[PDB]
Amino acid sequence: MKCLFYIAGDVSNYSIVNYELNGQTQNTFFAAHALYNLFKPDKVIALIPDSLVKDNVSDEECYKNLVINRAKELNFAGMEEFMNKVEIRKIPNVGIASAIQCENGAPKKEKNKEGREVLKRLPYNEKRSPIFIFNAIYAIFKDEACDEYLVDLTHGTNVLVSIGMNVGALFNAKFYSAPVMGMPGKDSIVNIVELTDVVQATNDSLMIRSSIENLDERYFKDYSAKLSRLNPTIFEEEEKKVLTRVKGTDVNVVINFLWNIRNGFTVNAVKSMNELKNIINQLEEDLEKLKSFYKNWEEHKNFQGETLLVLSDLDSTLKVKDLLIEGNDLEKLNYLLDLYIKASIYDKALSLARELPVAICLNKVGGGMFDDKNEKYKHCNEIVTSYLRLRYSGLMEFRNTLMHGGLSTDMKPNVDKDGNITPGKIVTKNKIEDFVKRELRNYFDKIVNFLSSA
Amino acid sequence: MKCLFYIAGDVSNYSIVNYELNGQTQNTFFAAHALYNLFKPDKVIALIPDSLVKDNVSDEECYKNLVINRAKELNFAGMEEFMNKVEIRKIPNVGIASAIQCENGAPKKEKNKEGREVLKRLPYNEKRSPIFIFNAIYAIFKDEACDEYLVDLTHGTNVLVSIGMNVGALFNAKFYSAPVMGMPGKDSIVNIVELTDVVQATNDSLMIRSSIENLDERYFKDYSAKLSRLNPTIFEEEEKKVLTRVKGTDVNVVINFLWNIRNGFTVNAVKSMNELKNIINQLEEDLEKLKSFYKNWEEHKNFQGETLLVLSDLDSTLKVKDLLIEGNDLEKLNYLLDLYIKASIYDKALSLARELPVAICLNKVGGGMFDDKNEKYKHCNEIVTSYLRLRYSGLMEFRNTLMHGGLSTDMKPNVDKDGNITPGKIVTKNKIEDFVKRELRNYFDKIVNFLSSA
């Protein structure tokens, strides 16, 4: 059960036009009607501000009559399923507006000495909060319990269409708008454009910039599906060069790189690092060409109407350059530790801060594998384990508490004879946080300090 | 270095008004000017669509002249120093628009048989994609490299203000718009509204809705700071009741509940669960009251200006009812395992799936502490460890592979005398993904089935 919302707006001076949205066309005089017939929602919500219509009992019924009083002035078709299958809900607006005056569900007409016009008593000055209007729009949206949504922004004030769009994004809502901008008389095909792709594409970039900042791959929205079907009809052989080098920027390598980081596979994360420097460098200068095309779009068409390829998806990916450091793999892990601390992922930070110091000696002792069989590891792990317990009683104690959690030999909870626990250990939280974010890198450095001269 | 952008718009018919934004007032004839004097940006960007101004050399030069040619008709003071501290950058628009025609950097004036006017040749009809306009505005915003941003939406088409707002959100921009909707003559104070809080309030809810779905607390934006200073001046002593139950809605316990889950303190997370069911009960039935207030906002205007308290922040918090199951703490963990799999965090899922069956025996065996001294644990852990290695060699095999990452006795990389790795135990993303998501719960249930009869 779909719903489709729109902003009301005064429609007494709109003309009959052919609105078109993706091949299908309809002949009405305002977008909501033309949009209604295209998608056939099970109900429709009108959302009429105070900027039009206020009488003494129920303003809502005057609006229903103003469209009927205008469907007469243009002798437009039946249109009666619309008026009898529409739920109208009044919403606030912000001051400087000028409001129509109705009387008892019919619009007040008055004399202008030349021709007959409607009585606008322009009394609308109201100082309202945007979050107040926002809260009011949210309440309408939640309490209709729809599935699909759909939203028309064609006909609202600059301030309301702004607030309405943000509410719609909370409901998997598709956005539609037809730029009226003047009266083209009867006919002159006006195009309705689908704003849904923009709203989706901006939340996509907030997740990505923060998926890199938090080292979490389940936030990186996978737009590789998009670049595959990225095919315009006619693009120049200069654009063919940069655009076909972007279709090939294999974003899978950066998702795999995060997944490997998130789950603790520091090896295939560090190993895979120098390969990303190739990918984001190619994407760095491939965006810079693309970034230059859209900068002076002037007569840079071909694109000029292509739905795929969003610069935001690319430029937000470039923040993954922050997770890349040039150098040798043992020092790449040393950087990866710091990444595990800026982002607040504590367990992996401790375990690497313990295991990396063993590898850094293995280098100093001429290399060896990480098995107990390998004697050079067996003995470096001893020095690390023993030096820790000598001066840094703290490090291992925390790491052991984060690896095995509550419900472990380490926390010692007390399962009672009835199915519920009585844990015997305070989760320390800030002592944990104060240690990892303020101490760990320093403890780690003093460990490697001692091991250098081996 | 601040910036302040605005949408251009036709200024030939704007009048002189008192723009007001937070006590301060400035006196100009279009909002973008008044905003500049208030915030003192280091530069200003014009952003001229094609919807106004088309001449033969530089469309950019006519707008700057069209603002001055209106700065004469109202003999407004400054403006000509302003006009050259404004860098004019041309942006696209979408069809049916009707454009002014300039000639040589001055607007073409014509004779209207009544009065002298500028020739609007209404030749603007364009089929552009919204993302195209978006990409071009993005290029403008990124390549200006500001610190603060600021954006005026007072003066743009509905389609541009939609697309423009989304660009601003990727640059931590504060949004401003003045509801024009008509000419209020000279004076009649027009108010600048700050749309910035709405945009923040909707991404804040996107992060909250996704913080619960992924069991990650560093996404939950904490609005409790807001509720502390949430106190209106005059609120009815019915609203005093419901609103005083919201300042006290202690959200700190739900963030702590997330942090405890992400880091593995499954005990004190589960222990704290039955306390949360009380909290979302109060916030659920307190949200329904608030939601009805904004449902009859028509005369409930003691909020008509309250900036704090966003419904989205509250209603999005309610999604945590999804992480709640009533019952005894042993079965609450049994649900917590499933949660560690819905959200794709495998290690905590595996490690809980191993230690929980040890607890589930202790109940059946009359309770005991989780320490090695306590023989009841000592012997239950033996049975599970032994039954696993008999029938489920896999569970522990992966669990041990996820707790300890690469750089461990379990993965066996080789660290060579030059500072490189070389992985040993190759386990792929999908072998892990397939095991936890498809098998673990079945392996886990059959363990408890066997242990039931103890």
Author numbering:
A (entry chain D), B (entry chain C): 1 to 454
From the manuscript:
SisCsx1, as other members of the Csm6/Csx1 family, is composed of an N-terminal CRISPR-Cas-associated Rossmann Fold (CARF) domain connected to an α-helical higher eukaryotes and prokaryotes nucleotide-binding (HEPN) domain by a helix-turn-helix (HTH) domain. The SisCsx1 monomers are curled around the two-fold axis to form a dimer, and three of these dimers oligomerize through their HEPN domains into an equilateral trimer, thus assembling into a hexamer. Each dimer contains a cOA4 binding site at the vertex of the triangular assembly, and a catalytic pocket located 70 Å away inside the triangular oligomer along the two-fold dimer axis. We show that cOA4 binding activates a cooperative sequential catalytic response in a hexameric SisCsx1 complex and that the RNase activity is switched-off by Ring nucleases, which cleave cOA423.
To address that in the current study, we solved the atomic structures of SisCsx1 in its apo and cOA4 (cOA composed of 4 AMP units) bound forms. A SEC-MALLS analysis revealed that SisCsx1 is an oligomer of 300 kDa corresponding to a hexameric assembly. A cryoEM map of the complex at medium resolution was used as a model to solve the phase problem by molecular replacement in an apo SisCsx1 crystal belonging to the P21 space group. The SisCsx1 hexamer is built because of a split helical insertion (V365-N400) and the last helix at the C-terminus (D445-A454) in the HEPN domain. The α-helix spanning residues 375-391, establishes a series of contacts with the same segment in the adjacent monomer with the helices inversely oriented, and a well-conserved cysteine bridge (C361-C380) positions the hexamerization helix. The helices fit into each other and the central interaction surface is mainly hydrophobic. The hydrophobic interface is flanked by several polar interactions.
